[PDB]
Design an enzyme around this catalytic site. Structure first.
Site, PDB file in Angstrom:
ATOM      1  N   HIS A 155       5.006  81.904  -0.182  1.00 59.14           N
ATOM      2  CA  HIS A 155       5.080  80.462  -0.357  1.00 59.14           C
ATOM      3  C   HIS A 155       3.718  79.864  -0.663  1.00 59.14           C
ATOM      4  O   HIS A 155       3.640  78.806  -1.291  1.00 59.14           O
ATOM      5  CB  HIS A 155       5.663  79.814   0.902  1.00 59.14           C
ATOM      6  N   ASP A 183       5.424  71.397   0.213  1.00 62.16           N
ATOM      7  CA  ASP A 183       6.393  72.404   0.584  1.00 62.16           C
ATOM      8  C   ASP A 183       7.651  71.724   1.123  1.00 62.16           C
ATOM      9  O   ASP A 183       7.620  70.627   1.699  1.00 62.16           O
ATOM     10  CB  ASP A 183       5.801  73.364   1.640  1.00 62.16           C
ATOM     11  N   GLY A 201      19.317  87.403   0.773  1.00 65.03           N
ATOM     12  CA  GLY A 201      20.203  86.504   0.051  1.00 65.03           C
ATOM     13  C   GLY A 201      19.563  85.864  -1.168  1.00 65.03           C
ATOM     14  O   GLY A 201      20.165  85.836  -2.254  1.00 65.03           O
TER      15      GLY A 201
END
Ligand SMILES: O=c1ccn([C@@H]2O[C@H](COP(=O)(O)OP(=O)(O)O)[C@@H](O)[C@H]2O)c(=O)[nH]1
Length: 433
Positions: free
Chosen positions: A15, A112, A358
């Site tokens: 991230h 973020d 996922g």
């Protein structure tokens, strides 16, 4: 006349990387903003801290603002990073006092997803651009999480191809799982952001993006704006493998790396090793102190380790962007974390996708749909066969090589002058003047 903007990064290497790339891009032409990069401290991993100080060393023009958030105490059976994410979401309401002290007064924030509720309630008059680090495809799922109230039946968002149950993180169906909690709290405030930025480009996810921006998903999202191909950062520390790559034939080397988050057991690594050895292909493989072979000799045993070392390099870390950009690399075996997808796409490197979670399964589907690669859905069910069969396709099939190359041409166009992503980012920055 030059805007002062804040880039508000969160936690975890995957991230932080796009936020550092964005801060670098905005502080440079043609954007030429004054950039303050907000860092949440204390950092969880030594790798994160190492990468940040290296970034500021190489980008002295960007201002560092430390945002201290107390580390939560670890809990049994709770993922440490989720606890850290939750910690960060819960502290976003404190950002106003810190961002308001900056000089000159700031024109916009690029934040973020964890800061969304805090920013959009406490600073409603300041343009807040929410910068997701995933695919537009997986981001759509995340924004729909408040509306998931069938734990075991595919989720159908209007206008999009359904999300099969085995590609949805199972926590998403429990509103009080820790990850779901901060996902819901922040997605519930996406409507108030000025836009969602995605590190993607129009031609890479055209059906997801056109559905989002036509209104078909029937969401209250703001405009979803691809800004990628983000330009990667110069690492001063040079890659010791580039001279070896210079001696391999064009497009002959398979690059293997499963990201920062790898969930592969020693047995899986061993079967992958046995598979690569049988394929006899050349390779660079990031497995797991950079000079230590002893763990690898223990893992594979001496005979297999030596056979592997005849054909490829087993290493602890590389400059991924430099490796993928080298003419000798012909393919990329990847978990399909979104940074690795985008890097590969920028270079037109065909991908063999072995996703583990996922969002990676959704990213692998995006990779396959775009013609960037092929997704081995059941790779875990037979690792040696999966590698032996598909490496010869990743590195020999001309149709996938040509479609992956076109992806690279489209990715380069998007971040060039007049490209769809460069225009978008320039229109955002221009709107601040
Ligand atoms: O040896 C390596 C392995 C990975 N990476 C970088 O680590 C990031 C992986 O992020 P991604 O989203 O792909 O996966 P995640 O780690 O979050 O699962 C990418 O930017 C890679 O370039 C790297 O620089 N060197």
């Amino acid at each position: 006349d030059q805007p002062h903007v804040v880039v508000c990064s969160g936690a975890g290497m995957g991230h932080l990387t796009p936020f550092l790339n964005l801060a670098s891009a905005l502080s440079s032409a043609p954007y030429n903003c004054k950039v303050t990069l907000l860092i949440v401290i204390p950092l969880i991993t030594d790798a994160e801290s190492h990468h940040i100080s290296s970034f500021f060393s190489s980008h002295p023009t960007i201002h560092r603002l430390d945002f201290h958030v107390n580390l939560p105490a670890p809990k049994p059976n709770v993922d440490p990073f989720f606890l850290r994410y939750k910690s960060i979401s819960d502290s976003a309401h404190r950002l106003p006092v810190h961002l308001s002290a900056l000089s000159p007064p700031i024109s916009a924030v690029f934040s973020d997803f964890l800061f969304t509720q805090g920013l959009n309630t406490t600073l409603p008059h300041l343009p807040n651009y929410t910068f997701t680090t995933t695919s537009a495809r997986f981001f759509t799922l995340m924004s729909y999480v408040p509306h998931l109230k069938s734990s075991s039946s595919p989720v159908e968002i209007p206008g999009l191809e359904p999300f099969p149950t085995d590609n949805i993180p199972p926590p998403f169906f429990n509103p009080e799982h820790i990850f779901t909690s901060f996902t819901i709290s922040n997605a519930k405030y996406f409507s108030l952001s000025k836009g969602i930025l995605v590190n993607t480009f129009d031609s890479f996810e055209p059906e997801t993006l056109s559905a989002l921006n036509s209104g078909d998903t029937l969401s209250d999202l703001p405009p979803v704006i691809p800004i990628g191909p983000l330009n990667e950062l110069e690492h001063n520390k040079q890659e010791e493998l580039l001279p070896w790559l210079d001696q391999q034939p064009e497009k002959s080397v398979l690059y293997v790396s499963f990201g920062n988050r790898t969930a592969m057991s020693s047995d899986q690594i061993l079967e992958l090793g046995m598979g690569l050895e049988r394929s006899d292909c050349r390779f660079i493989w990031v497995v797991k102190d950079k000079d230590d072979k002893s763990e690898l000799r223990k893992l594979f045993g001496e005979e297999l380790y030596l056979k592997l070392s005849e054909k490829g390099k087993l290493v602890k870390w590389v400059n991924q962007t430099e490796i993928l950009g080298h003419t000798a690399v012909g393919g990329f075996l990847s978990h399909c974390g979104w940074n690795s997808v985008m890097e590969a796409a920028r270079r037109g490197v065909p991908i063999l996708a072995w996703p583990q979670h996922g969002d990676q399964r959704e990213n692998a589907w995006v990779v396959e749909k775009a013609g960037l690669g092929v997704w081995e859905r059941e790779w875990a069910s037979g690792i040696q066969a999966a590698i032996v069969e598909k490496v010869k396709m990743i590195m020999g099939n001309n149709d996938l090589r040509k479609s992956a190359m076109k992806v690279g041409e489209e990715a380069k166009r998007a971040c060039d002058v007049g490209g769809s992503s460069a225009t978008a980012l320039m229109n955002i920055i221009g709107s601040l003047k």
